[PDB]
Amino acid sequence: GEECDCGSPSNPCCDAATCKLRPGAQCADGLCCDQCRFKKKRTICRIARGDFPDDRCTGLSNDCPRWNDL
């Protein structure tokens, strides 16, 4: 039922009425979230610390999963 997933009133992606997103908007913003909608794979969600490649998202989430080093 709930669809709270925003941290800005001014955000036109969201509505400050029932704390939900707009129609055609899945999320507000994030490392794996575009400015209204989800992102696609091969999106840089985090940088490597060393001896690893940059960490990319899957493109079906707002969260950013860490580069599981083996």
Side-chain angles (χ1 to χ4, degrees):
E2 75 290 89
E3 205 201 48
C4 288
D5 195 73
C6 192
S8 164
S10 179
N11 262 48
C13 297
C14 329
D15 213 282
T18 316
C19 177
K20 298 190 190 192
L21 282 282
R22 258 75 180 269
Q26 199 74 262
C27 56
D29 236 79
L31 287 160
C32 300
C33 167
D34 214 52
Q35 58 140 104
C36 263
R37 282 274 281 183
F38 272 19
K39 306 193 83 219
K40 300 184 189 295
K41 200 153 184 173
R42 311 188 207 83
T43 239
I44 304 281
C45 92
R46 255 290 299 172
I47 320 295
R49 279 179 152 63
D51 186 55
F52 321 121
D54 49 74
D55 163 20
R56 344 196 68 174
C57 223
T58 61
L60 69 118
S61 323
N62 144 261
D63 331 60
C64 164
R66 315 311 193 199
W67 216 82
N68 295 281
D69 184 12
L70 189 65

